[PDB]
Design a protein around this ligand. Structure first.
Ligand SMILES: NC(=O)C1=CN([C@@H]2O[C@H](COP(=O)(O)OP(=O)(O)OC[C@H]3O[C@@H](n4cnc5c(N)ncnc54)[C@H](OP(=O)(O)O)[C@@H]3O)[C@@H](O)[C@H]2O)C=CC1
Ligand SMILES: CCc1nc(N)nc(N)c1C#C[C@@H](C)c1cc(OC)cc(-c2ccncc2)c1
Length: 157
C-alpha cells in the first residue's frame, strides 16, 4: 500500500517557513497511530525541518544529495525507489513530494485543519470526483486542541 499522509488547512496550506503553521497534539497522535511499524517517505526539506527521525518506523528521505547519511534514516535518490519499499508506505511530505505522488497513491489520510493560516507551501488541488470518502471523523476539541479538524480517509476511485 502507498498512502499520502498530510495535514492541510482550508486553502490546502501545509507549511510556513519550514514549520507547521499550527500545533495540534491530536494530529501527532493520529500520525503515531497510523505510521508506527510502517514506512514514512519525505523530501529533504521536510526532514531537515525536524532534524531527527521519528522513532518506531522506517524513516526514508528522498534527496539528490549523495553524501546524505543521518543515523536512523535510510536514503533514496529517485521517485522510482519508492515502489521498491516493502510494506505500508506513507508519503509524508512535503509539497514537492506530494505533487509528485498524488497521482500514484492508492489512498490519502488527510487531516483538514478547519482554519486559514498564512502559508508558503501547499497541498496539491484535488477533487472528490476522483476520491471516495472512506471515513470522515471530526476531531475532538479541548484545552490542548483548540483548532477544529477533520480526519479524512480518501481512497482513489
Ligand atoms: N502539514 C503537513 O502535513 C506537511 C507539511 N510539510 C511542510 O512542507 C514544507 C516543505 O516542502 P517542500 O519545500 O516542497 O520540500 P520537500 O519536503 O518536498 O523536499 C524537497 C526536496 O526533496 C528532494 N526531492 C524531491 N523530489 C525529488 C526527486 N524526484 N529526486 C530527488 N530528490 C527529490 C529534493 O531534495 P534535494 O534538494 O536535497 O535534492 C527537494 O529539494 C515544509 O514547510 C514542511 O513544514 C511537510 C510534510 C507534511
Ligand atoms: C504531525 C504533522 C503531520 N500531520 C499529518 N496529518 N500529516 C503529516 N504528514 C504531518 C507531518 C509532517 C512533517 C513536518 C514532520 C516530519 C518529521 O520527520 C520525521 C517529524 C515531524 C514531527 C514529529 C513529532 N513532533 C512534531 C513534528 C513532522
Amino acid at each position: 500500500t502507498l498512502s499520502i499522509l498530510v495535514a492541510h488547512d482550508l486553502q490546502r496550506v501545509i507549511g510556513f517557513e519550514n514549520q507547521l503553521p499550527w500545533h495540534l497534539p491530536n494530529d501527532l497522535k493520529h500520525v503515531k497511530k497510523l505510521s508506527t511499524g510502517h514506512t514514512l517517505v519525505m523530501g529533504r526539506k521536510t526532514f531537515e525541518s525536524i532534524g531527527k527521525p521519528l522513532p518506531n518506523r522506517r524513516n526514508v528521505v528522498l534527496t539528490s544529495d549523495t553524501s546524505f547519511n543521518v543515523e536512523g534514516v535510510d536514503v533514496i535518490h529517485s521517485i522510482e525507489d519508492i515502489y521498491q519499499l516493502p510494506g505500508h508506505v506513507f508519503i509524508f511530505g512535503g509539497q514537492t513530494l506530494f505533487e509528485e505522488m498524488i497521482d500514484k497513491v492508492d489512498d490519502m489520510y488527510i487531516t483538514v485543519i478547519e482554519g486559514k493560516f498564512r502559508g508558503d507551501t501547499f497541498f496539491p488541488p484535488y477533487t472528490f470526483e476522483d476520491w471516495e470518502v472512506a471515513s470522515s471523523v471530526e476531531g475532538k476539541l479541548d484545552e490542548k486542541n483548540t483548532i477544529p479538524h477533520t480526519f479524512l480517509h480518501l481512497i482513489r476511485k
